[PDB]
């Protein structure tokens, strides 16, 4: 006989910042939970009725936090083996300091003109980059091209991810893989690294997942009815994120990034 065909599927995928906004619209901007005097939900807070609904839709309505600075998703950075480190072909040690230490990465992008011979990770600060260059080009004109020669924070990582040529990664990994073949615990380990990197690049090409989505620009917020611990973590992220936008620093970006790491996956 002919089978009674039934075709149903479900998929998970990384979520774009645009899809995060489409979920909420809805921006939570205040760290307030409930008013002390009226015992009512605070306006524009974690329980705002204009964002989540009157006090059944509060079980399903999402909100979001607009981060002043992008933060890496702790799943794809710290859980070994790292996905971001494998895709960028940089050791997690030299890439973790770009997020939690006082380092800076030179030449984050390659698709726009640059005129400085800096490259790699600089654990210290460039001396001339502090006074001479901003004065020569003026501060207003310097800010335009500043985040093209050397950048810092999780934002620098997102620029590297967004500017990756995934097809170049596959060809470079394949030729390096064969070169090691023609030539003991490191060669085998490096071969496994190259196979994972080219496997990772291929999946991005044939899907609609962008690798730069591994760095979060917006932070989706759980519906209030599912959080009648998590609320304190949300207030902590909002508090520091509101502090950072008042200053506008790098030490404050680490506080925002670390708070999001605690919210998403603690004990890492």
């Amino acid at each position: 006989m002919i089978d009674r065909y039934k075709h149903q599927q479900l998929r998970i995928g990384l979520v774009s910042p645009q899809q995060i906004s489409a979920w909420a619209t809805g921006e939570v901007t205040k760290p307030y939970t409930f008013h002390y005097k009226t015992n009512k939900p605070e306006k524009d807070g974690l329980f705002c009725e204009r964002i989540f609904g009157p006090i059944r839709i509060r079980r399903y309505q999402m909100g979001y936090i607009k981060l002043t600075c992008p933060v890496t998703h702790v799943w794809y950075l710290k859980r070994l083996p790292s996905y971001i480190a494998n895709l960028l072909d940089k050791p997690l040690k030299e890439l973790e300091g770009l997020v939690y230490c006082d380092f800076s990465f030179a030449r984050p992008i390659t698709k726009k003109p640059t005129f400085l011979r800096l490259r790699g990770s600089f654990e210290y600060e460039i001396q001339s980059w502090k006074y001479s260059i901003p004065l020569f080009f003026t501060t207003q004109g310097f800010e335009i091209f500043r985040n093209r020669e050397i950048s810092t924070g999780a934002g620098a990582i997102r620029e590297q991810l967004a500017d990756l040529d995934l097809r170049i990664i596959i060809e470079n990994s394949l030729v390096e893989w064969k070169q090691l073949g023609e030539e003991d615990r490191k060669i085998v380990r490096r071969k496994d690294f190259l196979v994972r990197r080219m496997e990772l690049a291929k999946h991005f090409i044939r899907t609609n997942i962008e690798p730069e989505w591994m760095v979060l620009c917006l932070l989706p917020v759980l519906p209030p009815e599912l959080r009648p611990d998590i609320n304190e973590l949300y207030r902590r992220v909002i508090y520091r994120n509101n502090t950072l936008t008042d200053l506008l620093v790098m030490c404050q970006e680490k506080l925002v990034q670390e708070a999001v790491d605690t919210l998403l996956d603690n004990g890492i």
């Binding site: 998970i12 799943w75 794809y76 859980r79 071969k191």
Partner: protein, 98 residues
Amino acid sequence: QITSKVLVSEEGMSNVFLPGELIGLLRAERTGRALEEAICYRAVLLGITRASLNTQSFISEASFQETARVLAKAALRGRIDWLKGLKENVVLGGVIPA
């Protein structure tokens, strides 16, 4: 289920299989008869725990063990679950295909 998988050897590199990939024994046999694309593999014994984390359903794996690792990998490649098994449909609250 323990003895139904082979491991692509470290030297088997092509556009069909990658070295270190876990593929079914029957699939490996059939591809060998049809291609000579460096399809090199060895039989591997998978324990029932490791076999349960290499299934066709990320929902079953995520509800068995190491949920965060399973979901992080599947989400990055847009993995699709076609809900052929039993526990998959139990989670969704549907009617099991049995």
